[PDB]
């Protein structure tokens, strides 16, 4: 019966919470008490990339750690040469309401998406010298929130239709559809081994998916508002989330629960972006109060601030070698910090 | 700088030129967001995205409707929002009032003005002369309301219609007047389905929106 199975859901809910409390012997704050703090992290704006005439929603770094792509509501993807500030490409978009962008690991493709519900793949290095739409991936019934390449032929897309999809770009069809979120999926992050990825939705839950099998291994629930940003730890055994409750949280994949909470009474605004450092000792988070905060991932202590933007910090990324961090804002500027 | 980094710098400067030239066109177009529940006659005003272009008095206008708790942040720098209400289906005016209240008090729409069209004022007239359906069932405060003496702008229409017509408008203005701080304004209008002045009305209201933005640039308002 519909009521009979309803109790079976709550019976297992306390059975899961029983296993989580059995495995919570100590806390990460207890173990990392006798470790040296990082001190004060003083980063300076090394570059200011200008040219976007509207607010910036997304940026992504290339794997060479020199090229990055940026998306703006003006309707254009710009590819910057961060070292020399030069623009490599300016890609006009069919729809101006872009919400995300991605950079293929090979460097051959960039992706894009927004309110048109279409993930558009662009061919960066072809003959004819220009940039062309390689493929348009239709099939989502809600807006596209985030997208990441697994390879040159496989991309993963999240959407406001409460689903995530895995696409074969050659054919143009969803290979796998991931279901289980009850709200608008807002972000995803790919594991270093690319066999798993985490999702974050507006139901205040994070879900760990299996790219191959196609199912949901784990569900993490500690937040109390929309989860806007998600990111793996470099180790691949943990990930960090940022929500509208002015709170970051660290979840352990193997312990199946939250380890640490990054909160401060002075912050009351939401978190738009999150990223880690190369070692995993720095948690960087962009906020709605115009600035970015660097956290010690192991001690829940602020280590610095990146206050150099005149509007909301929308996107944020760290280079693959850890040499720099880039921030984008609604003030239409990108800044490289080192 | 090497030989082909000067050429890279020169190519970058040509990209800046096209970006600047394309943003000049974007500055001469006014952008609108179209909003309103289904059955409101939303797609018959100017008689995931469905863009629509129209111009009036040599000014470009560019209107969007999305077919909202999250994506509404993208439309944070729009010139106005056009909210459309079926002012004749009394069963759902409460939904229209809570839908309008969420938009008005939204955190990212604090400086965006709303142009309020009340479609189906020809169907509101039939529902009030016939007398079969009354406001007072759905809104108790109707029996104690009276058309203001100063406000007598009803040309050639029945007195019973003008009271219900003005009561429905107040239910939306009082939401706007409550918490707006004067940083954004609600412009109300009445339209039936076939009013051909709807472009002029958005224009006159958008000209008032640009005037207030210009006054605040110079610390006059």
């Amino acid at each position, epitope marked *: 019966e519909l009521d009979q199975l309803r109790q079976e859901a709550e019976q297992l809910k306390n059975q899961i919470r029983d296993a989580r409390k059995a495995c919570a012997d100590a806390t990460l704050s207890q173990i990392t008490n006798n470790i040296d703090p990082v001190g004060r992290i003083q980063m300076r704006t090394r570059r200011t990339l200008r040219g976007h005439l509207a607010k910036i929603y997304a940026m992504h770094w290339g794997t060479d750690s*020199r090229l990055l792509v940026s998306a703006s509501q003006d309707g254009k993807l710009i590819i910057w040469d961060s070292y020399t500030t030069n623009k490599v490409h300016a890609i006009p978009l069919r729809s101006s309401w872009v919400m995300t962008c991605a950079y293929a690991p090979s460097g051959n493709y960039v992706a894009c998406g927004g309110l048109d519900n279409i993930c558009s793949i662009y061919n960066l290095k072809t003959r004819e010298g*220009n940039v062309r739409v390689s493929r348009e991936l239709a099939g989502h019934t809600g807006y596209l929130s985030c997208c990441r390449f697994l390879d040159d032929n496989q991309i993963v897309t999240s959407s406001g239709d409460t689903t995530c999809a895995l696409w074969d770009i050659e054919t143009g069809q969803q290979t796998t559809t991931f279901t289980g979120h009850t709200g608008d999926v807002m972000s995803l992050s790919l594991a270093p081994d690319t066999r798993l990825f985490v999702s974050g939705a507006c139901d205040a839950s994070a879900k760990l998916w299996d790219v191959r099998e196609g199912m949901c291994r784990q569900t993490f629930t500690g937040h109390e508002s929309d989860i806007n940003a998600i990111c793996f730890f470099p180790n691949g055994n943990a990930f960090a989330t940022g929500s509208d409750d002015a709170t970051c949280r660290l979840f352990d994949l193997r312990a199946d629960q939250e380890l640490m909470t990054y909160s401060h009474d002075n912050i009351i605004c939401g978190i738009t972006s999150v990223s880690f450092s190369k070692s995993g000792r720095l948690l960087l988070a962009g906020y709605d109060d115009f600035n970015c905060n660097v956290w010690d991932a192991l001690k829940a202590d602020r280590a610095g601030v990146l206050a150099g933007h005149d509007n909301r910090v929308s996107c944020l990324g760290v280079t693959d070698d850890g040499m720099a961090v880039a921030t984008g804002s609604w003030d239409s500027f990108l800044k490289i910090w080192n | 700088v*090497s030989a082909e980094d000067k050429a890279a710098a020169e190519r970058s400067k040509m990209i800046d030129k096209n970006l600047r030239e394309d943003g000049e066109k974007a500055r001469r177009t006014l952008r609108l967001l179209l909003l309103g529940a289904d059955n409101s006659g939303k797609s018959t005003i100017v008689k995931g995205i469905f863009e629509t272009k129209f111009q009036v008095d040599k000014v470009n206008f560019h209107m969007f409707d999305v077919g909202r708790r999250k994506w509404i942040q993208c439309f944070n720098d729009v010139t106005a929002i056009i909210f459309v209400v079926d002012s004749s289906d009394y069963n759902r005016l409460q939904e229209a009032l809570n839908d309008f209240k969420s938009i008005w008090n939204n955190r990212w729409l604090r400086t965006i003005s709303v142009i309020l069209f009340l479609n189906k004022q020809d169907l509101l007239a039939e529902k009030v002369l016939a007398g079969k359906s009354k406001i007072e069932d759905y809104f108790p405060e109707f029996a104690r309301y009276t058309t203001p003496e100063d406000a007598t702008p009803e040309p050639g229409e029945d007195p019973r219609v003008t009271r219900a017509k003005y009561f429905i408008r107040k239910e939306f203005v009082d939401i706007s007047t409550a918490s707006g701080d004067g940083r954004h304004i609600c412009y109300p209008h009445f339209t039936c389905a076939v009013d051909t002045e709807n472009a002029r009305r958005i224009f006159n209201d958008c000209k008032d929106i640009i005037l207030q933005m210009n006054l605040r640039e110079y610390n006059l308002v």
Partner: single-chain antibody
Amino acid sequence: VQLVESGGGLVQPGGSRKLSCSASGFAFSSFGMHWVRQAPEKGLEWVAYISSGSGTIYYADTVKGRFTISRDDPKNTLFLQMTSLRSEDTAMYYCVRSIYYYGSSPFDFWGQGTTLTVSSDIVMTQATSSVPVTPGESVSISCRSSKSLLHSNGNTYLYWFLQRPGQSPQLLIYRMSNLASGVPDRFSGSGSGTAFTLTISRLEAEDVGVYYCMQHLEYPLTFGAGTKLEL
């Protein structure tokens, strides 16, 4: 991608001519264009260059003052104006497209040339002038330069070209290490400043001709003498 060129013919000394090249099949307005000639039996020499947007024009000192380069971007055509023609102005004239951004490969496409028959600098040398190589054998082609092509940005600005008999030259290596698009992986390049090598492992037919090494560090652009491979 095509670059067909027209003009040519016999011109008396002191005469004048106009050489035109038309592009078809690529975004012509975003490519810089070069004129490179080779004398009837001699090597490759660089003439002129016009940037995208026509903002930068360079000439070789031999033709400076009496040669004008121009382009008509809407009509997809490149020009060269001959004035005060000389007996040293007889050559196969080639048109070359170049695009310069981070990671680009300039001098990708050369065009079939036209023949005109008119009746300091980085000197860089290919000491070997002729090499007979048996098929299937590794062969190394080397050239050196007067100064270092290694720049402060870590880019070494040396390029390798191949000219098969009766053919326009094509690019093999750009910036001394990178293979061009559509080139077998058996081609490799290496070397430090002022000492460079091109290795052809598992040599085959249709892999013979004259090999040139161009420097792109500074203008004027300099080519090598040409180390040729014969069966």
